[PDB]
Amino acid sequence: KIEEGKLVIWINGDKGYNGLAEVGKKFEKDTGIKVTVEHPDKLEEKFPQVAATGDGPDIIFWAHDRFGGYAQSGLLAEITPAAAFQDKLYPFTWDAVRYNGKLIAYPIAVEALSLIYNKDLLPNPPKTWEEIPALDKELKAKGKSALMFNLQEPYFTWPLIAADGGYAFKYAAGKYDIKDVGVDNAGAKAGLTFLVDLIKNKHMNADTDYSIAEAAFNKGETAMTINGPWAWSNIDTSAVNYGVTVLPTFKGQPSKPFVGVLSAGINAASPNKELAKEFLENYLLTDEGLEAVNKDKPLGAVALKSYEEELAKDPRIAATMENAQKGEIMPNIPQMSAFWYAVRTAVINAASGRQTVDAALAAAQTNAAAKNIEKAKIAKLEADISAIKSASLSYYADESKYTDGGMISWVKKDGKIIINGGFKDNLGMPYNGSYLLMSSPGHEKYLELSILPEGEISKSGLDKLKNDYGNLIDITNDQNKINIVIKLLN
């Protein structure tokens, strides 16, 4: 497994490993424990594999959104920072490294999209999205465009869509509700419509991707663009007088970009959790520690309050932090994968005019939430089946039969359950259909529960019921009233 008495650290190759190695030198100097900083490739997928076998690095640096999945697999240890140390970091950064109720990583850096503008073409960037059309008409008269940014990835268009109410997953009490997606709400409809209106009025092109927008801004063809700190170096080699500021507002509300928090997690299988904690809290997450890493590679905005005030001297870094505070922490749950494809398809379909804004977002809401909504409905259906079996078994232990009276029927009328003018002996009934229990007086091995669910169940849903009860289910009548029968006894 992992050798005791040392620290193995994984970080991406674009992060400051030479400066991080210097922090390890000062740590070895003061403690005698050697620290090796390696930056191998494909570590975001190498870690969950290798750590499942109880191996890997002691500390892993990566964006916070993948750590929630790691925590679900039990690959990350719970960190124990004192309240005194937590106050050294911005409070909202601690929310990016939370799964369930526990802290599972140290926040390091903070990144978000910002508005990048050409100071020669536009010395005063606009504060609102609504004034960009008139700015484009004024700039097109001189052969320039107002704004070009990547429309192919929902990461870049989401700040406008979410500004008026859109959200990925509802965050309630440290937990994300994977059944609640805010893609088809009124706010997302307003944001996407304004984006589509910009395209239909020839202010932007629906085929604009990352490379086309970056090339146009670097050659001084467009006055503005939307990008993150990773693109600054390509603008510096272009030498165009550019600035970085807060994203424009939409309907009086700020744009809400997804916030990415570079985080350091401790391997649950590491025998050096105290060493990792000591290194991260009192060596890396200091003014000297972050400066050494930043001298090797700029971190952008950082979660440490004391050092962020120093980095904020760069107005580009100050703008990145400002847009991040006004944005939404990117959910760290693996259900975001279905969110990305759903929104990506909706934006592309609406931008090219293949669907209406309502039809694109209605499909995306389905593409992002329907499978998780059905998973809950199926589990509640199985909860009723186990409850009916439990109550039927409790009748045997005290009486001498199952149903007693021949048949029992549950049918859901208008909000309540009824047993039809005759009581026998709380079931949510997620599909509002009908339950019916079959048993003839005699024997001890003949219980048959038949269900007539209302609504509809996908093929992936019915197959979930075939993977749980084996051959104990015979699904008939796939048209009109579907029928599910289960033998509650083995």
What's the chain look like in SS3?
CCCCCCEEEECCCCCCHHHHHHHHHHHHHHHCCCEEEECCCCHHHHHHHHCCCCCCCCEEEEEHHHHHHHHHCCCECCCCCCHHHHCCECHHHHHHHEECCEECCEEEEEECCEEEEECCCCCCCCCEHHHHHHHHHHHHCCCCEEECCCCCCHHHHHHHHHCCCCECCEEECCEEECCCCECCCHHHHHHHHHHHHHHHCCCCCCCCCHHHHHHHHHCCCEEEEEECHHHHHHHHCCCCCEEEECCCEECCEECCCEEEEEEEEEECCCCCHHHHHHHHHHHHCCHHHHHHHHHHCCCCEECEHHHHHHHCCCHHHHHHHHHHHCCEECCCCCCHHHHHHHHHHHHHHHHCCCCCHHHHHHHHHHHHHHHHHHHHHHHHHHHHHHHHHHHHHHHHHHCCCCCCCCCEEEEECCCCEECCCCCCCCCCCCCCCEEEEECCCCCCCCCEEEEECCCCCCHHHHHHHHCCCCCCECCECCCCCCEEEEECCC
Exposure on the CB side of residue 360, measured as CA atoms within 13 A: 24
- Tell me how the structure was determined: X-ray
**Residue 416: other Cβ atoms inside 10 A:** 6
Q: Report CA torsion sign: 238, 244, 247, 249.
A: negative
Question: For residues 435 and 389, what is the distance between their CA atoms, to the nearest angstrom?
Answer: 13
Question: For residues 480 and 453, what is the distance between their CA atoms, to the nearest angstrom?
Answer: 11
**Residue 458: other Cβ atoms inside 10 A:** 12
* CATH class of the domain defined by 114-256+334-355: alpha beta
Question: For residues 229 and 53, what is the distance between their CA atoms, to the nearest angstrom?
Answer: 36
The residue type at 70: Y
User: Resolution of this PDB entry, in A?
Assistant: 2.3
Domains 7-111+260-311 and 114-256+334-355 agree in fold: yes
Q: Which two tokens stand for residue 474?
A: 């015979």
Rama region for 59: left / alpha / beta (φ>0; ψ in -120 to 50; rest):
beta
Q: Are 367 and 338 in contact (CB under 8 A)?
A: yes
Return the residue matching tokens 């870690």. 47
Question: For residues 17 and 30, what is the distance between their CA atoms, to the nearest angstrom?
Answer: 20
**Cα of 143 vs its chain's centroid, Å:** 40
Q: Which two tokens stand for residue 390?
A: 């439990």
CA-angle at 340, arms to 97 and 255, nearest 5°: 70
Q: Are 235 and 242 in contact (CB under 8 A)?
A: yes
**Domain spans of the chain, in order of start:** 7-111+260-311, 114-256+334-355, 373-487
In sequence order, the β-bridge partners of residue 449 are 437, 486
Residues closing a segment before a gap in the chain (C–N exceeding 2.5 Å) = 425
Residues 6+ apart with CB under 8 A from 240: 118, 120, 217, 218, 220
* CATH class of the domain defined by 7-111+260-311: alpha beta
Query: Strands 7-10 and 59-63, how do they pair?
Result: parallel
In sequence order, the β-bridge partners of residue 388 are none
Q: What CA dihedral angle connects 44, 48, 50 and 52, to 10 degrees?
A: 170
- Burial of 428 by CB count in 10 Å (0-12 exposed, 13-18 middle, 19+ buried)? middle
Report which of 126, 129, 88 is spatially closest to residue 106, judged by C-alpha positions.
88
Residues 6+ apart with CB under 8 A from 362: 184
**Residue 294: other Cβ atoms inside 10 A:** 19
